[PDB]
Structure formats: structure tokens, C-alpha cells
Amino acid sequence: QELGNANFENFIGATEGFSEIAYQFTSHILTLGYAVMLAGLLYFILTIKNVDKKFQMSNILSAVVMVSAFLLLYAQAQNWTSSFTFNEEVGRYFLDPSGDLFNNGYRYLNWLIDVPMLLFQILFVVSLTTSKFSSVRNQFWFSGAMMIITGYIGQFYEVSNLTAFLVWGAISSAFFFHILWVMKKVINEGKEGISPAGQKILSNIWILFLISWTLYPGAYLMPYLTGVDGFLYSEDGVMARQLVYTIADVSSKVIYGVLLGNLAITLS
């Protein structure tokens, strides 16, 4: 299997193919993904006037994240549809040799760019207490970048060497735990010396952040979560993975932005 060696979407597409439902669902979900980013982009442009100058860098960075997310998810969406074509004889969609093939680059690039801005963002709304801005900022940038790069290396091996896919996933996960831990510290310090209404919103932000962000390794693992011959090892694990990525992207970029915007209005 030469054509389907690059990733699980290709593997499936070149061997079993995708039902009508799997192909259409995944296409629609990816389209909702970028459409929400565009709407978010507008929301963040239009509401920047509602926070004090002091906090506006957060709204700016929300907007910038929306731009890159709109572009790269639009591109990922097109890459889905143009990589798989219907075959009349079997009634399924197959990896098209005349296309460019499914490619995770668009999404991994988006993460490299958005992770550092999403993490930095909050440092323009909350005030630290005992920690330094530059230290926190550097810990987030370095660990975020490493998390993504090591996850990108892992994903090459997804079908060729599943063991490696997992080892690199675990290294990536170690960077992830460090980010959660710095973020929990940022949230606790940001709670010190704001109103209880501000603290309740920070509490929500932590929950959102924690769940959102954990969906990413969930979706990386998704086709293996029922074992090497189970139910998700299939087009359904492709559908599940792309659905979960899309929910994660909306939650981590959009809802997170909105919550941060509301925190900043509270502090204004």
C-alpha cells in the first residue's frame, strides 16, 4: 500500500474507502469549522471597543488566531473533498491518485501558530502575583512549540509504525502537562485581587481550557481507543477524530476568546 502510507485518513481511503455518510459528514463538519472561525473573526473585530485599552491586545490576538484558523481550516476542508472521489462500482469514496492526498499539515501548522497566541493572550487580561510575565511567557512558548513539533513527528508514523506514533505522542503529552501546570498557576494568580464575578469567569476558563485542550490528544488517539481491530479502527474513527478536532478548535479558540473578552469587561 504505497498511496495510503501517510496517515490513517489515506489508509482508510485507499483500502476500505468511505461511505457516503462518512465522506459527507466529515466534509460538513470541516466546513462548519471554518465558517465558525470567520464568524468569530468578525465578532472579535466588532467587540474590541467594549474593553479598556489595557486589555485589547487579547482581543487583537483572538482576531489573529481566527484569521489563521479560518485560512488553514478552509484549506483542510478543501483538501478533504478534493482527495477522495466516488467510485460507482463499489459506491464508496476512495483516495484519488490524481488529487494531492489528505494532509495533516494544514492543521498542525495552525496549531504551531495558534498555541503560542492562545497561551500568551490571557497574560494581557489577568495580573500575575508572584510569577514573572517573561518567565511564564517563555515556558508557554517553548513547551507549546515542542508539544506541536513532537506531535507532528509522531503523526508521520501513524500507520507505518504505530509504536513510534505513540512514543512521540507521549513525549508531546509531557509538554502538554507542563502547559496545564503553568496555566493552573496563571489562573490562580489571576484570581488574587479581582472581584468574585471575575474569579467565577476564571474558573470557567480553566475548565474550558482543560477539557478543550485534552480533546486534541483524544482525537490523535481516537482510531486506536477500541484496540487494533475494534469499531473506531475505521471510517468511524475518522469521523470521530475530525468531529472532535472541530469541537476542540471552536472551544479553544472561540469560546475561550469570548470568555476572556468577558473577563476583560468585568475588569474594565
Which key features would you list for this structure?
elongated; two-stranded antiparallel sheet; 72% helix; membrane; transmembrane; Rhopdopsin 7-helix transmembrane proteins; mainly alpha; 268 residues; Arc/bac/fun_rhodopsins; 8 helices; transmembrane helix
Tally of individual helices? 8
- Using the 3D structure, state the CATH architecture: Up-down Bundle
CATH class descriptor: Mainly Alpha
Order of helices and strands: HHHEEHHHHH
* SS-based class: mainly alpha
Radius of gyration: 20 Å
The CATH H-level homologous superfamily: Rhodopsin 7-helix transmembrane proteins
> What proportion strand?
under 5%
Coarse shape: elongated
Number of strands: 2
Protein name: Sodium pumping rhodopsin
Transmembrane segments: 25-46, 58-77, 108-128, 140-157, 163-183, 204-223, 243-265
Subcellular location: Membrane
Keywords: Membrane, Transmembrane, Transmembrane helix
